[PDB]
Design a binder for this molecule. Structure first.
Ligand SMILES: *[C@@H]1O[C@H](CO)[C@@H](O[C@@H]2O[C@H](CO)[C@@H](O[C@@H]3O[C@H](CO)[C@@H](O)[C@H](O[C@H]4O[C@H](CO)[C@@H](O)[C@H](O)[C@@H]4O)[C@@H]3O)[C@H](O)[C@H]2NC(C)=O)[C@H](O)[C@H]1NC(C)=O
Ligand SMILES: *[C@@H]1O[C@H](CO)[C@@H](O[C@@H]2O[C@H](CO)[C@@H](O[C@@H]3O[C@H](CO)[C@@H](O)[C@H](O[C@H]4O[C@H](CO)[C@@H](O)[C@H](O)[C@@H]4O)[C@@H]3O)[C@H](O)[C@H]2NC(C)=O)[C@H](O)[C@H]1NC(C)=O
Ligand SMILES: *[C@@H]1O[C@H](CO)[C@@H](O[C@@H]2O[C@H](CO)[C@@H](O[C@@H]3O[C@H](CO)[C@@H](O)[C@H](O)[C@@H]3O)[C@H](O)[C@H]2NC(C)=O)[C@H](O)[C@H]1NC(C)=O
Ligand SMILES: *[C@@H]1O[C@H](CO)[C@@H](O[C@@H]2O[C@H](CO)[C@@H](O[C@@H]3O[C@H](CO)[C@@H](O)[C@H](O)[C@@H]3O)[C@H](O)[C@H]2NC(C)=O)[C@H](O)[C@H]1NC(C)=O
Ligand SMILES: *[C@@H]1O[C@H](CO)[C@@H](O[C@@H]2O[C@H](CO)[C@@H](O)[C@H](O)[C@H]2NC(C)=O)[C@H](O)[C@H]1NC(C)=O
Ligand SMILES: *[C@@H]1O[C@H](CO)[C@@H](O[C@@H]2O[C@H](CO)[C@@H](O)[C@H](O)[C@H]2NC(C)=O)[C@H](O)[C@H]1NC(C)=O
Ligand SMILES: *[C@@H]1O[C@H](CO)[C@@H](O[C@@H]2O[C@H](CO)[C@@H](O)[C@H](O)[C@H]2NC(C)=O)[C@H](O)[C@H]1NC(C)=O
Ligand SMILES: *[C@@H]1O[C@H](CO)[C@@H](O[C@@H]2O[C@H](CO)[C@@H](O)[C@H](O)[C@H]2NC(C)=O)[C@H](O)[C@H]1NC(C)=O
Ligand SMILES: O=C(O)CC[C@H](NC(=O)N[C@@H](Cc1ccc(O)c(I)c1)C(=O)O)C(=O)O
Ligand SMILES: O=C(O)CC[C@H](NC(=O)N[C@@H](Cc1ccc(O)c(I)c1)C(=O)O)C(=O)O
Ligand SMILES: *[C@@H]1O[C@H](CO)[C@@H](O)[C@H](O)[C@H]1NC(C)=O
Ligand SMILES: *[C@@H]1O[C@H](CO)[C@@H](O)[C@H](O)[C@H]1NC(C)=O
Ligand SMILES: *[C@@H]1O[C@H](CO)[C@@H](O)[C@H](O)[C@H]1NC(C)=O
Ligand SMILES: *[C@@H]1O[C@H](CO)[C@@H](O)[C@H](O)[C@H]1NC(C)=O
Ligand SMILES: *[C@@H]1O[C@H](CO)[C@@H](O)[C@H](O)[C@H]1NC(C)=O
Ligand SMILES: *[C@@H]1O[C@H](CO)[C@@H](O)[C@H](O)[C@H]1NC(C)=O
Ligand SMILES: [Ca+2]
Ligand SMILES: [Ca+2]
Ligand SMILES: [Cl-]
Ligand SMILES: [Cl-]
Ligand SMILES: [Zn+2]
Ligand SMILES: [Zn+2]
Ligand SMILES: [Zn+2]
Ligand SMILES: [Zn+2]
Lengths: 691, 691
């Protein structure tokens, strides 16, 4: 038989291992020749594996690279302008790669050029609340200072935005062992920890869903009109550069001014973590000087798009996508995901060669330039938005398959909760101690739901990966899954460093490739069910449950201000009414879906299911973020990686007690309540009988 | 049999006459009790006629009314402030209606209050080119002047916008016999001409598709958050009032300053048509004073929505809608249209009672507040946008059925050209001299296509009626049809006056109701075919033909500036490439559509047909007009009634030689070319094979 079991049994750990090795021998930085060669390799192989068509879709987008003959670095500089200490020009390469060429040195992609000199201020994680503490409570002024911030907690682009708005003239990002060195494990090559010479690369844009900075709304094709750099979306206005903790210790050890306000501001280095501004008395006249010379350059990128045409509903697309570009070798990020996709394509293609076709069309994507701002996925979705709007069933992401070896992690739309529970009850746990038990059982035991006994945690989707355009702009049901760490004992330490290699994975994370295989089973199984189930495997009642939770949550935030809710007549009644209606209507729709031989009623019903995530899209977008259009979920305005629920109302409430004109501020809260209640009611109404 | 012929034969001229009489005995001004009573009457009757459900959908929107105890009027005022002449406080009522209560006096809906006093400047039709001539060529400055403008040529809201931007402090609109009195016909009650006491009511907003001024984007429901008046959309900033030609002659006869620049500025009154500013020597110290006291008021409106559920595709909607609210009696506008809709519902309901149901669902709408800015249709579409986006097949408008008795007028999307040609070849001509000939034959003879021999003229859709939200915001294929005048011998003279009565229609326009019946046949026949044809009756190849015409046209406009196209490298190559591709792909799609028992392939193909108009929507909208989202068609920025093709490129080119920064101006032309080429290519691609 050709059923899900046939598909799942064909997946092999040994094949994922071979592909991972194959994809991680040389760097595949977006825009480089090596990455174009790997795109052509994947295109050829997906053809051989049996897909109906496999094409390259290319775009010319803004990328950013260091200057090879004018390296970026940071100095401590004395009274005379002598540079008495310089940060490293490259990470010491790992064993056996010391002769690999074209390893891009650590840099912050899209930093402007400059050589700012100034006094340091230490701003902890450079979160919104860190700057509030500095400015409001400690009365420290960052204006015209160089800020030094530890990586961690939030997306680095939010850190740079927050430093910019505080008036900083430069930002230094570093990896503190508190956040990147797990107690009791050795540094790479001897363990999975970050060494003191290790440095995390990464872009520092604030694109808010725009994709290529020069072409927001439209694909960056051959005839595209591009904005000038001055009007580009998301670019930082101050220079930024990342360093490791050996170098950080040298910049921090001399820090003076004020002490850290409390222990949450202290990392693990043997330094005081003084906030400054500037150095202690002896060194008070030394300054810090950045030298940044990177350039932004329009550069060609290549997505690979494979199609397995559906036998019954070819105009319904289920998409499995993840990126191919890496900062260096991409041993975890992204190739651990790309190898899993490669083996999924191979398994589907094996079934196809035996005569099977899925019910719906499956599209497979190897995206480019994810590391530079989700550019490949976004430009493709911009090009194909009308097809995706009207035909897109679901998007399953496939970046890193592992960030630990403890248990499963799933983030997805509520519409896929039931599918995930059901699929994981049918899969074997790879975990020690759970031999012969289901993945559902191991996962639920290790990661219990905070709301429900006997159920596993499933998180909201945030952003910082290629599902953003599909979910938050276009409203296509989306999900992701990987193996993760115990967030109780301790991202992963070697993230975006040169040390993320095949050997890291094979020696320390997944020597048997059993966690990779489990993740291939979850991702591929989801794609299988979505593309093959007669009735789409979405349960609208699961959205009704979560909408009530989010309504309670946002009402609770507002209720911290009872006097203002009285004064400005701020009512949540319409939002709870809408959520009640959604719950009633979804319950009735579910009865019909179970109670309805009629392919038109079915597809009618399949379309109601497919367009339900679509209904939460507001074509006017969220305030000042036109490409975040989903009214229930957006990336947090303080941390792109985190999802926020009822984001329009959340941001209207955030720090409201500091607003100068409360009448205006609470009016905007009321406006966002109206928009949310309306959108929830309108989405409910798409599930009513159609006529 | 239950086929189109059964439907068409059931329609009766005698019934349209009875309904027209019934709908025009009292005023039905939006927001008044009389109009709510008529809504309830129609709701009851549509139920009796056999529709499955008939509901009222209400909204609370900004309306505008004169103050009953503080009447609006205009004066000539002397040196002492004595008002030596006053305009009329009401139109003399027609015979037998002199005792009708609640006739709203002439006013400009949404005018602000004020009593500006000043010197007059006469600005012809107050078109963009009239103000260019005044300011650029004649060097007359309107700043702080009261402008007097003749009605005609363009929507009155464009006149008021143009006067405002010229710095006027008030606007007086009047009806010149040149534009509202046909030679050789008598004034009402003795003929169909406008008498000198007649005055055209009408709103003067510039909403650009927003609907209710206080709630753009969202329905004006019970919990809606409303903008303050200061932030409302579209409201004029200067007082405006309309007058008849007896009164106009009194204001114009004393005009001094400059002579009219040429004869196109002279109407038919026995006055010089001096542009002024101000009066001739003897009267140079007299001024004109407006007294406007109307108020804007949030007021409840009611749409009637009837549903005839589809037998096979209930989740596909074909919509026949027109408005019910009138300025006074609405003898032509809208009740000549509403009576036709009423008889169409009755005919469909007769078939239904015999056991028939259309293939798709048909929705019937009696919209409210059309006269105040398309408010009822727009708020409903805002409420139901997700249902309409994903399910809307087509929208057929049904305002005034007649504006003359000469021949047919059709304005529609290219997708309906073939449907219209085919339907009219099957209908009988009602015209004298064409007994036993088809409507297609009479229409083509009287209104030949300017491009094609043996074909009739079909115009682009403009705006100023209830199809705007469906077509230009939502991208639902739309059309309209009515009987019209010979635009060669000579709107209609009694437009929006108290004289538009049942007797006007019965005595002078259509005593036998045969033109009404013909229009019921065209509108109802279109609805029938759209709701019943197995394959949707759209021909994508007709769009390919018109896109090439519009590309040639906009390229020709640009080519008036060959030096700038050289300097800034302005190429139309991508747009012609896209149009060529669309033509190739549409040709192939058409072959498959004819060459394809498979209901999934059919509906797949029906969805490609339905979503083709949808594909021309840009979710970012046009520049500063976010609710005009169709890239091929928008209402002209100089005249809401007229359609403009490639509007983004057209407005970027318009008056470009006057722009201060040509580099920026031509860059924006290039940007609009890119957006248009991209959108045309993306629409073409929705017609490619789906996988
Ligand atoms: C959840 O679904 C329910 C339906 O099951 C839906 O209920 C609707 O609520 C609206 C808004 O409250 C009701 O609107 C009323 O409609 C009547 C006519 O039917 C009007 O007369 C009412 O207006 C009067 O009262 C108002 C409030 O006191 C005054 O402000 C106003 O000036 C009028 O005097 C009012 O507009 C509607 O009838 C029901 N529909 C039903 C029960 O079928 C509810 O809105 C849904 N929730 C959301 C968020 O959409
Ligand atoms: C109409 O449909 C046709 C397809 O039938 C479609 O043709 C496509 O045109 C694009 C844009 O011109 C072509 O893009 C090229 O793609 C090749 C790789 O396939 C690239 O190597 C090319 O880039 C080189 O040359 C450029 C121009 O000289 C340079 O600017 C660039 O730096 C590179 O050196 C180029 O990107 C594409 O191949 C075809 N596709 C085909 C033939 O299948 C056309 O775009 C459609 N019209 C619209 C408006 O979409
Ligand atoms: C996840 O799996 C659960 C458990 O199998 C699925 O729920 C079950 O779905 C079936 C099919 O809809 C339900 O059976 C139905 O029962 C009703 C009588 O109550 C009957 O009228 C129908 O003909 C049909 O037999 C079953 O009740 C239901 N079990 C539950 C909810 O406990 C669920 O659908 C799966 N989720 C997916 C696939 O997304
Ligand atoms: C308006 O009416 C015209 C004329 O009837 C319709 O065009 C005709 O449509 C039929 C059905 O598609 C075409 O017949 C087909 O012919 C091909 C062979 O060339 C054959 O393979 C098919 O099986 C089928 O018999 C016919 O050619 C065509 N006539 C034309 C274009 O001259 C047209 O579809 C109507 N428009 C509508 C309904 O919107
Ligand atoms: C990754 O695997 C691919 C495919 O097996 C290898 O590419 C092939 O290399 C052989 C021998 O050089 C050629 O004859 C084929 O044409 C290639 N196939 C392709 C590109 O589809 C590639 O060498 C492997 N890379 C590494 C680093 O081992
Ligand atoms: C840090 O690097 C800088 C730049 O390479 C070094 O300063 C340079 O030293 C060379 C050789 O002595 C001089 O010719 C240049 O004039 C210097 N350049 C600048 C910009 O100052 C500096 O010596 C290094 N410091 C340490 C401690 O290694
Ligand atoms: C327009 O026609 C309607 C329907 O025939 C008339 O309304 C009916 O009037 C009768 C007699 O007064 C009542 O018994 C019915 O209840 C009404 N039917 C409705 C409202 O559905 C109405 O009188 C006519 N109007 C005019 C001006 O002739
Ligand atoms: C135009 O109308 C105005 C306003 O009604 C008239 O002026 C008023 O005349 C009355 C009675 O004589 C006075 O009590 C008011 O003081 C006047 N009001 C104003 C605002 O001036 C005026 O007489 C009318 N002119 C003509 C020619 O009929
Ligand atoms: O530009 C963007 O939006 C993201 C680009 C790039 N994305 C990325 O690295 N995403 C990673 C980030 C991440 C890794 C591990 C985690 O546990 C978490 I939470 C986030 C991922 O989603 O796996 C980046 O964060 O620098
Ligand atoms: O607010 C709006 O957009 C339009 C409201 C109202 N609409 C309206 O009267 N439309 C009329 C205008 C019209 C009448 C006859 C014509 O030949 C033409 I061209 C336009 C119609 O479309 O039949 C108006 O123009 O005042
Ligand atoms: C890189 O720096 C070199 C050496 O100073 C310089 O010649 C070149 O302009 C730079 N390259 C860029 C800006 O891409
Ligand atoms: C911080 O310092 C800058 C630069 O001198 C100054 O303009 C700004 O107002 C200061 N802010 C506060 C709150 O002290
Ligand atoms: C793998 O699991 C073991 C056992 O819990 C653990 O001690 C080790 O830290 C894990 N490896 C990684 C990279 O998390
Ligand atoms: C209308 O004018 C009267 C009479 O002067 C006045 O009392 C009332 O305020 C006005 N009504 C309004 C503004 O609606
Ligand atoms: C028109 O008159 C106004 C008001 O006095 C003046 O401000 C404006 O500049 C004038 N415009 C021109 C072009 O003369
Ligand atoms: C009706 O048609 C006749 C004959 O052409 C014409 O003279 C008359 O003006 C028409 N009536 C109207 C209102 O157009
Ligand atoms: Ca883009
Ligand atoms: Ca609205
Ligand atoms: Cl992922
Ligand atoms: Cl109409
Ligand atoms: Zn990644
Ligand atoms: Zn990454
Ligand atoms: Zn009308
Ligand atoms: Zn009208």
């Amino acid at each position: 038989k050709h059923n899900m079991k046939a598909f799942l049994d064909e997946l092999k750990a040994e094949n994922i291992k071979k592909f991972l090795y194959n994809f991680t021998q040389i760097p595949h930085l977006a825009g480089t020749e090596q990455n174009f060669q790997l795109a052509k390799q994947i295109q050829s192989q997906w053809k051989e594996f049996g897909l109906d068509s496999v094409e390259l879709a290319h775009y010319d987008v803004l990328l950013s690279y260091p200057n090879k003959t004018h390296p970026n670095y940071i100095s401590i500089i004395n009274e005379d302008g002598n540079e008495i200490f310089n940060t490293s020009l490259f990470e010491p390469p790992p064993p056996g790669y010391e002769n690999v060429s074209d390893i891009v040195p650590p840099f912050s992609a899209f930093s402007p050029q400059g050589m700012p000199e100034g006094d340091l201020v230490y701003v902890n994680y450079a979160r919104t609340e860190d700057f509030f503490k500095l400015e409001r409570d400690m009365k420290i002024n960052c204006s015209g200072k160089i800020v030094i911030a530890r990586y961690g907690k939030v997306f680095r682009g939010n850190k740079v935005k927050n430093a910019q708005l505080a008036g900083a003239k430069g930002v230094i990002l570093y990896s503190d062992p508190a956040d990147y060195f797990a107690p009791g494990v050795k540094s790479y090559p001897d363990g999975w920890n970050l060494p003191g010479g290790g440095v995390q690369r990464g872009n520092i844009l604030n694109l808010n869903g725009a994709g290529d900075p020069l072409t927001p709304g439209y694909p960056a094709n051959e005839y595209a009109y591009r904005r000038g750099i001055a009007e580009a979306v998301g670019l930082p206005s101050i220079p930024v550069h990342p360093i490791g903790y050996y170098d950080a210790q040298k910049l921090l050890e001399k820090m003076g001014g004020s002490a850290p306000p409390d222990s949450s501001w202290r990392g693990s280095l043997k330094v005081p973590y003084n906030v400054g501004p500037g150095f202690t008395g002896n060194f008070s006249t030394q300054k810090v000087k950045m030298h940044i010379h990177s350039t932004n350059e329009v550069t060609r990128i290549y997505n690979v798009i494979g199609t397995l045409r559906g036998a019954v509903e070819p105009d319904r697309y289920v998409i499995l996508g993840g990126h191919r570009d890496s900062w260096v070798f991409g041993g975890i990020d992204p190739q651990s995901g790309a190898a899993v996709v490669h083996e999924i394509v191979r398994s589907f293609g094996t079934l196809k060669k035996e005569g099977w076709r899925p019910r719906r069309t499956i599209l497979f994507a190897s995206w480019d330039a994810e590391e530079f701002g989700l550019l490949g996925s976004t430009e493709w979705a911009e090009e194909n938005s009308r097809l995706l709007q009207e035909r897109g069933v679901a998007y399953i992401n496939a970046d890193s398959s592992i960030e630990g070896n403890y248990t499963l992690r799933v983030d997805c739309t509520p519409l896929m909760y039931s599918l995930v529970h059901n699929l994981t009850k049918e899969l074997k746990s790879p975990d020690e101690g759970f031999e012969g038990k289901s993945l559902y059982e191991s996962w639920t035991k290790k990661s219990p739901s905070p709301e429900f006994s006997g159920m596993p945690r499933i998180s909201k989707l945030g952003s910082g990966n290629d599902f953003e355009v599909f979910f938050q702009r276009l409203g296509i049901a989306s999900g992701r899954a990987r193996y993760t760490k115990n967030w109780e004992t301790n991202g992963y330490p070697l993230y975006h460093s040169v040390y993320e290699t095949y050997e890291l994975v094979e020696k320390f994370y997944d020597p048997m490739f059993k966690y990779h295989l489990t993740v291939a089973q979850v991702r591929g199984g989801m794609v299988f069910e979505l593309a093959n189930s007669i009735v789409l495997p979405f349960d609208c009642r699961d959205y009704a449950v979560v909408l009530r939770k989010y309504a309670d949550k946002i009402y609770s935030i507002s209720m911290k201000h009872p006097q203002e809710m009285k004064t400005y007549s701020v009512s949540f009644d319409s939002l709870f009414s809408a959520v009640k209606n959604f719950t009633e209507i979804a319950s009735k729709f579910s009865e019909r879906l179970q109670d309805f031989s009629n392919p038109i009623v079915l597809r009618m019903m399949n379309d109601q299911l497919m367009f339900l995530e679509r209904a939460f899209i507001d074509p006017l977008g969220l305030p000042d973020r036109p490409f975040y259009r989903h009214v229930i979920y957006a990336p947090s305005s303080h941390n792109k990686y985190a999802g926020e629920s009822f984001p329009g109302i959340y941001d209207a409430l955030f720090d409201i007690e500091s607003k100068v004109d409360p009448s205006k501020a609470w009016g905007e809260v009321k406006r966002q309540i109206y928009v949310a209640a309306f959108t929830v009611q309108a989405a409910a109404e798409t599930l009513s009988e159609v006529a």
